[PDB]
Design an enzyme around this catalytic site. Structure first.
Site, PDB file in Angstrom:
ATOM      1  CB  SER A  13      -0.813   0.081   1.205  1.00 53.29           C
ATOM      2  OG  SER A  13      -1.718  -0.899   1.158  1.00 53.29           O
ATOM      3  CD  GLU A  33       6.154  -6.986  -2.952  1.00 50.74           C
ATOM      4  OE1 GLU A  33       6.052  -5.985  -2.204  1.00 50.74           O
ATOM      5  OE2 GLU A  33       6.166  -8.065  -2.203  1.00 50.74           O
ATOM      6  CB  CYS A  41      -4.161  -4.248   1.433  1.00 48.67           C
ATOM      7  SG  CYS A  41      -6.049  -3.597   0.987  1.00 48.67           S
ATOM      8  CB  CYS A  46      -8.437  -4.602   2.474  1.00 42.79           C
ATOM      9  SG  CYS A  46      -6.757  -3.828   2.916  1.00 42.79           S
ATOM     10  CE  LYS A  49     -12.014  -6.964   5.279  1.00 41.87           C
ATOM     11  NZ  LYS A  49     -11.207  -6.401   6.283  1.00 41.87           N
ATOM     12  CB  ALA A 114      15.625  -4.760  -0.845  1.00 39.74           C
ATOM     13  CB  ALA A 174      -9.374  -9.860  21.438  1.00 38.19           C
ATOM     14  CB  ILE A 177      -7.257 -10.006  11.664  1.00 39.97           C
ATOM     15  CG1 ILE A 177      -6.675  -8.826  10.890  1.00 39.97           C
ATOM     16  CG2 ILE A 177      -6.962 -11.232  11.078  1.00 39.97           C
ATOM     17  CD1 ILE A 177      -5.259  -8.690  10.995  1.00 39.97           C
ATOM     18  CD  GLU A 180     -12.424  -7.419   9.185  1.00 32.65           C
ATOM     19  OE1 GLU A 180     -11.357  -7.767   8.826  1.00 32.65           O
ATOM     20  OE2 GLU A 180     -12.825  -6.161   9.208  1.00 32.65           O
ATOM     21  NE  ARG A 197      -3.844 -13.162  26.731  1.00 37.28           N
ATOM     22  CZ  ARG A 197      -2.934 -13.991  26.708  1.00 37.28           C
ATOM     23  NH1 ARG A 197      -2.666 -15.157  25.767  1.00 37.28           N
ATOM     24  NH2 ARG A 197      -2.304 -14.209  27.807  1.00 37.28           N
ATOM     25  NE  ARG A 203      -8.361  -5.458  27.002  1.00 34.26           N
ATOM     26  CZ  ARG A 203      -8.097  -4.815  27.598  1.00 34.26           C
ATOM     27  NH1 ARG A 203      -8.926  -4.402  28.753  1.00 34.26           N
ATOM     28  NH2 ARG A 203      -6.568  -4.678  28.045  1.00 34.26           N
ATOM     29  N   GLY A 261      -1.951 -11.072  16.705  1.00 31.73           N
ATOM     30  CA  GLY A 261      -1.231 -10.037  16.388  1.00 31.73           C
ATOM     31  C   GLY A 261      -0.394  -9.968  15.131  1.00 31.73           C
ATOM     32  CG  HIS A 438     -37.993   7.402   5.870  1.00 33.62           C
ATOM     33  ND1 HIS A 438     -37.507   6.731   7.065  1.00 33.62           N
ATOM     34  CD2 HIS A 438     -39.387   7.005   5.888  1.00 33.62           C
ATOM     35  CE1 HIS A 438     -38.739   5.751   7.663  1.00 33.62           C
ATOM     36  NE2 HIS A 438     -39.577   6.155   6.809  1.00 33.62           N
TER      37      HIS A 438
HETATM   38  C1  LIG Z   1      -6.323  -9.923   7.296  1.00 29.07           C
HETATM   39  C2  LIG Z   1      -6.182  -8.484   6.999  1.00 29.07           C
HETATM   40  C3  LIG Z   1      -7.318  -7.698   6.791  1.00 29.07           C
HETATM   41  C4  LIG Z   1      -7.229  -6.409   6.645  1.00 29.07           C
HETATM   42  N1  LIG Z   1      -8.434  -5.679   6.294  1.00 29.07           N
HETATM   43  C5  LIG Z   1      -8.021  -4.271   5.942  1.00 29.07           C
HETATM   44  C6  LIG Z   1      -9.371  -3.410   5.890  1.00 29.07           C
HETATM   45  O1  LIG Z   1     -10.152  -3.978   5.849  1.00 29.07           O
HETATM   46  N2  LIG Z   1      -8.921  -2.037   5.801  1.00 29.07           N
HETATM   47  C7  LIG Z   1      -7.826  -1.563   5.873  1.00 29.07           C
HETATM   48  O2  LIG Z   1      -7.474  -0.293   5.764  1.00 29.07           O
HETATM   49  N3  LIG Z   1      -6.440  -2.107   6.219  1.00 29.07           N
HETATM   50  C8  LIG Z   1      -6.758  -3.654   6.350  1.00 29.07           C
HETATM   51  N4  LIG Z   1      -5.644  -4.524   6.613  1.00 29.07           N
HETATM   52  C9  LIG Z   1      -4.347  -3.667   7.015  1.00 29.07           C
HETATM   53  C10 LIG Z   1      -3.480  -3.508   5.729  1.00 29.07           C
HETATM   54  O3  LIG Z   1      -3.449  -4.550   4.662  1.00 29.07           O
HETATM   55  C11 LIG Z   1      -2.258  -3.037   5.961  1.00 29.07           C
HETATM   56  O4  LIG Z   1      -2.485  -1.871   6.800  1.00 29.07           O
HETATM   57  C12 LIG Z   1      -1.755  -2.300   4.568  1.00 29.07           C
HETATM   58  O5  LIG Z   1      -1.339  -3.422   3.728  1.00 29.07           O
HETATM   59  C13 LIG Z   1      -0.265  -2.102   5.122  1.00 29.07           C
HETATM   60  O6  LIG Z   1       0.281  -1.312   3.956  1.00 29.07           O
HETATM   61  P1  LIG Z   1       2.245  -1.411   3.996  1.00 29.07           P
HETATM   62  O7  LIG Z   1       2.488  -0.693   2.734  1.00 29.07           O
HETATM   63  O8  LIG Z   1       2.459  -0.816   5.351  1.00 29.07           O
HETATM   64  O9  LIG Z   1       2.506  -3.022   3.970  1.00 29.07           O
HETATM   65  P2  LIG Z   1       2.151  -4.171   3.144  1.00 29.07           P
HETATM   66  O10 LIG Z   1       1.009  -3.895   2.272  1.00 29.07           O
HETATM   67  O11 LIG Z   1       2.387  -5.287   3.830  1.00 29.07           O
HETATM   68  O12 LIG Z   1       3.298  -4.363   2.025  1.00 29.07           O
HETATM   69  C14 LIG Z   1       4.759  -4.476   2.523  1.00 29.07           C
HETATM   70  C15 LIG Z   1       5.349  -5.045   1.236  1.00 29.07           C
HETATM   71  O13 LIG Z   1       6.902  -5.381   1.587  1.00 29.07           O
HETATM   72  C16 LIG Z   1       7.255  -6.465   0.869  1.00 29.07           C
HETATM   73  N5  LIG Z   1       8.440  -6.637   1.543  1.00 29.07           N
HETATM   74  C17 LIG Z   1       8.901  -6.601   2.885  1.00 29.07           C
HETATM   75  N6  LIG Z   1      10.144  -6.798   2.955  1.00 29.07           N
HETATM   76  C18 LIG Z   1      10.858  -6.513   2.033  1.00 29.07           C
HETATM   77  C19 LIG Z   1      11.985  -6.515   1.261  1.00 29.07           C
HETATM   78  N7  LIG Z   1      12.945  -6.485   2.153  1.00 29.07           N
HETATM   79  N8  LIG Z   1      12.227  -6.220   0.086  1.00 29.07           N
HETATM   80  C20 LIG Z   1      11.264  -6.371  -0.880  1.00 29.07           C
HETATM   81  N9  LIG Z   1       9.951  -6.467  -0.301  1.00 29.07           N
HETATM   82  C21 LIG Z   1       9.763  -6.423   0.877  1.00 29.07           C
HETATM   83  C22 LIG Z   1       6.162  -7.681   1.100  1.00 29.07           C
HETATM   84  O14 LIG Z   1       6.297  -8.626   0.384  1.00 29.07           O
HETATM   85  C23 LIG Z   1       5.026  -6.830   1.073  1.00 29.07           C
HETATM   86  O15 LIG Z   1       4.412  -6.919  -0.178  1.00 29.07           O
HETATM   87  C24 LIG Z   1      -5.777  -5.871   6.755  1.00 29.07           C
HETATM   88  C25 LIG Z   1      -4.769  -6.668   6.868  1.00 29.07           C
HETATM   89  C26 LIG Z   1      -4.870  -7.995   7.252  1.00 29.07           C
HETATM   90  C27 LIG Z   1      -3.753  -8.793   7.535  1.00 29.07           C
HETATM   91  C1  LIG Z   2     -44.862   4.004  -3.319  1.00 29.96           C
HETATM   92  C2  LIG Z   2     -44.210   5.327  -2.674  1.00 29.96           C
HETATM   93  C3  LIG Z   2     -42.919   5.049  -2.365  1.00 29.96           C
HETATM   94  C4  LIG Z   2     -42.099   6.351  -1.515  1.00 29.96           C
HETATM   95  N1  LIG Z   2     -40.936   6.232  -0.882  1.00 29.96           N
HETATM   96  C5  LIG Z   2     -40.425   6.847  -0.526  1.00 29.96           C
HETATM   97  C6  LIG Z   2     -39.133   6.890   0.381  1.00 29.96           C
HETATM   98  O1  LIG Z   2     -38.532   6.063  -0.058  1.00 29.96           O
HETATM   99  N2  LIG Z   2     -38.543   8.190   1.121  1.00 29.96           N
HETATM  100  C7  LIG Z   2     -39.464   9.227   1.441  1.00 29.96           C
HETATM  101  O2  LIG Z   2     -38.687  10.207   1.921  1.00 29.96           O
HETATM  102  N3  LIG Z   2     -40.811   9.335   0.982  1.00 29.96           N
HETATM  103  C8  LIG Z   2     -41.210   8.350   0.258  1.00 29.96           C
HETATM  104  N4  LIG Z   2     -42.352   8.237  -0.365  1.00 29.96           N
HETATM  105  C9  LIG Z   2     -43.169   9.817  -0.038  1.00 29.96           C
HETATM  106  C10 LIG Z   2     -43.937   9.582   1.412  1.00 29.96           C
HETATM  107  O3  LIG Z   2     -44.540   8.533   1.408  1.00 29.96           O
HETATM  108  C11 LIG Z   2     -44.649  10.979   1.555  1.00 29.96           C
HETATM  109  O4  LIG Z   2     -43.751  12.113   0.899  1.00 29.96           O
HETATM  110  C12 LIG Z   2     -45.138  11.093   2.763  1.00 29.96           C
HETATM  111  O5  LIG Z   2     -45.986  10.064   3.174  1.00 29.96           O
HETATM  112  C13 LIG Z   2     -46.079  12.513   2.612  1.00 29.96           C
HETATM  113  O6  LIG Z   2     -46.755  12.757   4.167  1.00 29.96           O
HETATM  114  P1  LIG Z   2     -47.790  13.473   4.243  1.00 29.96           P
HETATM  115  O7  LIG Z   2     -47.952  13.770   5.818  1.00 29.96           O
HETATM  116  O8  LIG Z   2     -47.715  14.748   3.633  1.00 29.96           O
HETATM  117  O9  LIG Z   2     -49.092  12.578   3.526  1.00 29.96           O
HETATM  118  P2  LIG Z   2     -49.440  11.137   4.032  1.00 29.96           P
HETATM  119  O10 LIG Z   2     -48.411  10.415   4.693  1.00 29.96           O
HETATM  120  O11 LIG Z   2     -49.857  10.636   2.834  1.00 29.96           O
HETATM  121  O12 LIG Z   2     -50.659  11.308   5.099  1.00 29.96           O
HETATM  122  C14 LIG Z   2     -51.757  11.896   4.708  1.00 29.96           C
HETATM  123  C15 LIG Z   2     -53.049  11.262   5.552  1.00 29.96           C
HETATM  124  O13 LIG Z   2     -54.014  12.195   5.465  1.00 29.96           O
HETATM  125  C16 LIG Z   2     -55.335  11.101   5.287  1.00 29.96           C
HETATM  126  N5  LIG Z   2     -56.279  12.016   4.883  1.00 29.96           N
HETATM  127  C17 LIG Z   2     -56.340  12.612   3.790  1.00 29.96           C
HETATM  128  N6  LIG Z   2     -57.463  13.308   3.646  1.00 29.96           N
HETATM  129  C18 LIG Z   2     -58.193  13.217   5.022  1.00 29.96           C
HETATM  130  C19 LIG Z   2     -59.296  13.726   5.660  1.00 29.96           C
HETATM  131  N7  LIG Z   2     -60.028  14.637   5.046  1.00 29.96           N
HETATM  132  N8  LIG Z   2     -59.639  13.193   6.988  1.00 29.96           N
HETATM  133  C20 LIG Z   2     -58.790  12.413   7.676  1.00 29.96           C
HETATM  134  N9  LIG Z   2     -57.404  11.832   7.098  1.00 29.96           N
HETATM  135  C21 LIG Z   2     -57.305  12.310   5.731  1.00 29.96           C
HETATM  136  C22 LIG Z   2     -54.945  10.054   4.325  1.00 29.96           C
HETATM  137  O14 LIG Z   2     -55.496   8.924   4.784  1.00 29.96           O
HETATM  138  C23 LIG Z   2     -53.378   9.792   4.982  1.00 29.96           C
HETATM  139  O15 LIG Z   2     -53.215   8.617   5.944  1.00 29.96           O
HETATM  140  C24 LIG Z   2     -43.348   7.452  -1.143  1.00 29.96           C
HETATM  141  C25 LIG Z   2     -44.330   7.390  -1.627  1.00 29.96           C
HETATM  142  C26 LIG Z   2     -44.812   6.392  -2.385  1.00 29.96           C
HETATM  143  C27 LIG Z   2     -46.187   6.712  -3.052  1.00 29.96           C
END
Ligand SMILES: Cc1cc2nc3c(=O)[nH]c(=O)nc-3n(C[C@H](O)[C@H](O)[C@H](O)COP(=O)(O)OP(=O)(O)OC[C@H]3O[C@@H](n4cnc5c(N)ncnc54)[C@H](O)[C@@H]3O)c2cc1C
Ligand SMILES: Cc1cc2nc3c(=O)[nH]c(=O)nc-3n(C[C@H](O)[C@H](O)[C@H](O)COP(=O)(O)OP(=O)(O)OC[C@H]3O[C@@H](n4cnc5c(N)ncnc54)[C@H](O)[C@@H]3O)c2cc1C
Ligand SMILES: OC[C@@]1(O)OC[C@@H](O)[C@@H](O)[C@@H]1O
Ligand SMILES: OC[C@@]1(O)OC[C@@H](O)[C@@H](O)[C@@H]1O
Ligand SMILES: [K+]
Ligand SMILES: [K+]
Lengths: 449, 449
Positions: A13, A33, A41, A46, A49, A114, A174, A177, A180, A197, A203, A261, A438
């Site tokens: 990296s 290398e 990684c 990474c 994994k 190296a 712990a 790694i 995961e 441990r 922890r 570790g 939402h």
């Molecule tokens: C299982 C696991 C999961 C991980 N998951 C994540 C994650 O999800 N997100 C994240 O950010 N990090 C993660 N990491 C950490 C990440 O892999 C390391 O922090 C990162 O690789 C470190 O980069 P580096 O350049 O220090 O070393 P490295 O990427 O290890 O590179 C060192 C290189 O030097 C080479 N080398 C060593 N000595 C010599 C030499 N004398 N001559 C030539 N080449 C040499 C080695 O062969 C190696 O390729 C994870 C690590 C492990 C073990």
């Molecule tokens: C298919 C679909 C997907 C959607 N997905 C999303 C989403 O992912 N994210 C998002 O933010 N928004 C989404 N929306 C929009 C969201 O549902 C509306 O913006 C939100 O419900 C509006 O709230 P409101 O209070 O204006 O009206 P409503 O929640 O429609 O409430 C109005 C209420 O007034 C009642 N009513 C009407 N007239 C009268 C009356 N005279 N007397 C008594 N009760 C009455 C009705 O029965 C109803 O219950 C979606 C809408 C649809 C149709």
């Protein structure tokens, strides 16, 4: 002997990101290398994994949720080899993409390990290479425990090498790694056991998150074993493995995955000749600009002992190249408030301070917390209702948001935009002022009272 | 004759929200609802739509993506009646929740259709009720075309009344309702045809969103028929329906759904006696504070002719109650930069100005657009790769973000946080300064160059 303006050791990296950016500014660059481009990684991190996580989501759609949506299905076969083949083909396409990018930027890519000769010279495949600027971006590797039978276990690299669906698996660890891997295996149908441990995995995450994760694991799996310290692994006559814990409990499984570790790859490259300082655990010490203590040597990523994430390595590497080669002497990465997602079941997103951290830092009277708890709409029509919980941690009379935490369906995609808002200094009123979308899980973050 | 401080006509999104908030400030309130609590959204809108969308996601996981993740499945039965039963049970639970909330706030809920007697008096079920403040939150209803055979078609309410999986369906319309319904039916396996009058559905959305949607529809269905104006619907001897288009084309189907538009429910409540002004289409005219031209009469939601979304009706209703009953004379809803998601396949998220709108408003030299195009990782290992495209529309030298648009897996959950950032005045630099979360679709919004 070949000379370059900039040489990156490690094509993961950080190295790829940094070398490509330097090349864009006309520098003569090389990338060394030892294994595959993309590093941890792309190859064993990474990317694979996430593919496996998606496979588990599909399995759960079929087995858990589908029936209540009217889908009476039969899984004739779950072809693990096909899944792995497709995962591997995707990774191959990523390698090819990186190769094209590097070739188009005229970066010399060298396949080999190296080793330093002096502070500005390395040897690879018997050739000597010098450079004015050297980036060490070598990453890390999985750690293994020193207990009897530890060798019967595999690590996260081994998890990606599995070529069949395991029937019973013990995952030990712990951190993200372990969580995961255990979640993926559980979702796919493996009888899965997770061993931590202390009281929970993750922890130190916010208690809201930790307790919700425990609730979900305790309903849907994996089976969580807490206050569980591995003592030994026994290989039985039938080929099965029994993990013995220090509390006297034992669990028998077919495969055991150590996810306890990682450790930095700074020990086999003859770093001693460079004078570069490392801490007691082997991590290279760097300043805010990724400089080591040696002029002309830098380090980014997992080998530096900090936020071990791909985007951090990438951003640090790019900003370093901007600084060195695009006349931006102050360019650097801000390591504060970096967002993290854990691909648990369900996923977790977190940024900033937990509630306890904020209270400790600012005092109780300065902290205000908002929370929401609801049922994920996807699961609401089913017999497998799942919770979603969210928290905003605020400080001061203006309620500046200092922490954002959530666990639930969609958290993986929800967090990024909120991270932008928090980086801009968002307050609760900024969230109040934004109209909800939402129906989504995300809207709950802007509707709390 | 009963007297109340505040009376809401319509127990939908706006009415429930407004009446509950007023009740919280000690006002004596009544709510009149002719049908079911929760209005259009809960009963025949956002809620059942999302349940059906999730059913389609499951069907696609099984039929489209699953096989390439290794799942060889057989759907023994797709039980539409079971899906509808579970959907209906969830809606019943929502009704019960609203009833408890209203009862706990001591709101008198009356089931009947209210008709005005004078500006401050209504009649319902033969009972006369007066109130100092009256909110008209009556929403709207589906419109139907005046062509031969129109009666053979159903509308969106009819879609929710279907009790079996349709085999062949014609959906007519070009708004979000038509797109969503067509996408759901197509995902579930119905042979689905979508008919739009001009070049595309959602024709005024950003061209990047529109053209990507066309691309996906043209690969995965529904079958899109453009420049298609309904002429007549013929009922054939075998019971099937043939939709004849003016251009001479026709399509035979089993069911036809009109999703052309909606109209306001302002025509049957004797509104004429109140003096309340409506526009030519029947929408109640309101000022920024939801006031009609008649003192003591307000309107919110779909009956007012604006942003027909649930959170808008809710927020306008709550803010109105804050204004009237919690001594906040300037409290009102800001209708600018409201985010929208369309639950298409794949979903769309949009906020603010499209690129053409921004260029027209500010001039070409003031607009900078950033875009990203990539393949959704979920689909990348499959034989059904799907695009994800995103756009940031920026204005001025500081590149203030005035529009955010995306289409792709996850867009439904990605948008909310970005809406907060845009409401705070985010610029491209604010996005640049936020570290990415990997691997996600959302990170592409903060990585554009
Ligand atoms: C299982 C696991 C999961 C991980 N998951 C994540 C994650 O999800 N997100 C994240 O950010 N990090 C993660 N990491 C950490 C990440 O892999 C390391 O922090 C990162 O690789 C470190 O980069 P580096 O350049 O220090 O070393 P490295 O990427 O290890 O590179 C060192 C290189 O030097 C080479 N080398 C060593 N000595 C010599 C030499 N004398 N001559 C030539 N080449 C040499 C080695 O062969 C190696 O390729 C994870 C690590 C492990 C073990
Ligand atoms: C298919 C679909 C997907 C959607 N997905 C999303 C989403 O992912 N994210 C998002 O933010 N928004 C989404 N929306 C929009 C969201 O549902 C509306 O913006 C939100 O419900 C509006 O709230 P409101 O209070 O204006 O009206 P409503 O929640 O429609 O409430 C109005 C209420 O007034 C009642 N009513 C009407 N007239 C009268 C009356 N005279 N007397 C008594 N009760 C009455 C009705 O029965 C109803 O219950 C979606 C809408 C649809 C149709
Ligand atoms: O897969 C083997 C390995 O050595 O490859 C290079 C790096 O990804 C290491 O973390 C990893 O252990
Ligand atoms: O379902 C019938 C209907 O009259 O119920 C009340 C409102 O939801 C209307 O939009 C709808 O057409
Ligand atoms: K809000
Ligand atoms: K960024």
């Amino acid at each position: 002997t070949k000379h370059y303006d900039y040489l990156a050791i490690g094509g993961g990296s950080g190295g790829i990101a940094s070398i490509n950016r330097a090349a864009m500014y006309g520098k003569k660059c090389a990338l060394i290398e030892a294994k595959q481009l993309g590093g941890t990684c792309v190859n064993v991190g990474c990317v694979p994994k996430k593919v496996m996580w998606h496979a588990a989501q599909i399995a759960e759609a079929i087995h858990l949720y589908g029936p209540d949506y009217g889908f009476d299905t039969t899984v004739n076969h779950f072809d693990w080899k096909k899944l792995i083949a497709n995962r591997t083909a995707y990774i191959d396409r990523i390698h090819q993409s990186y190769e094209r990018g590097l070739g188009n930027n005229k970066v010399d890519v060298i396949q080999g390990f190296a080793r330093f000769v002096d502070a500005h010279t390395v040897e690879v495949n018997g050739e000597t290479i010098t450079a004015d600027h050297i980036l060490i971006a070598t990453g890390g590797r999985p750690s293994h425990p020193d207990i009897p039978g530890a060798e019967y276990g595999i690590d996260s690299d081994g998890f990606f090498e599995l070529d069949e669906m395991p029937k019973r698996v013990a995952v030990v660890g712990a951190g993200y790694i372990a969580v995961e891997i255990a979640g993926v295996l559980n979702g796919l149908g493996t009888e899965t056991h997770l061993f931590v441990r202390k009281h929970a995995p993750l922890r130190t995450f916010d208690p809201l998150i930790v307790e919700t994760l425990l609730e979900v694991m305790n309903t849907e799996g994996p089976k969580l074993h807490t206050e569980s310290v591995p003592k030994a692994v026994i290989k039985n006559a039938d080929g099965s493995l029994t993990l013995q814990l220090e509390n006297g409990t034992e669990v028998t499984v077919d495969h055991l995955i150590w996810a306890i570790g990682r450790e930095p790859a700074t020990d086999n490259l003859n770093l001693s000749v460079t004078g570069v300082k490392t801490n007691d655990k082997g991590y290279i010490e760097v300043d805010k600009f990724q400089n080591t203590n040696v002029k002309g040597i830098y380090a980014v990523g997992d080998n530096t002992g900090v936020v071990e994430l791909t985007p951090v390595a990438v951003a640090a590497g790019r900003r370093l190249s901007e600084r060195l080669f695009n006349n931006k002497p102050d360019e650097h990465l801000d390591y504060s408030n970096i967002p993290t997602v854990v691909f648990s079941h369900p996923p977790i997103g977190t940024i900033g301070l937990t509630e306890p951290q904020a209270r400790e830092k600012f005092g109780d009277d300065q902290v205000k917390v908002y929370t929401s708890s609801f049922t994920a709409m996807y699961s609401a029509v089913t017999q497998h209702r799942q919770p979603c919980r969210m928290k905003l941690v605020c400080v001061g009379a203006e309620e500046k948001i200092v922490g954002i935490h959530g666990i639930g369906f969609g958290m993986d995609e929800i967090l990024q935009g909120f991270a932008v808002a928090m980086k801009m200094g968002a307050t609760k009123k900024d969230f109040d002022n934004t109209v909800a979308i939402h129906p989504t899980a995300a809207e709950e973050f802007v509707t709390m009272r």
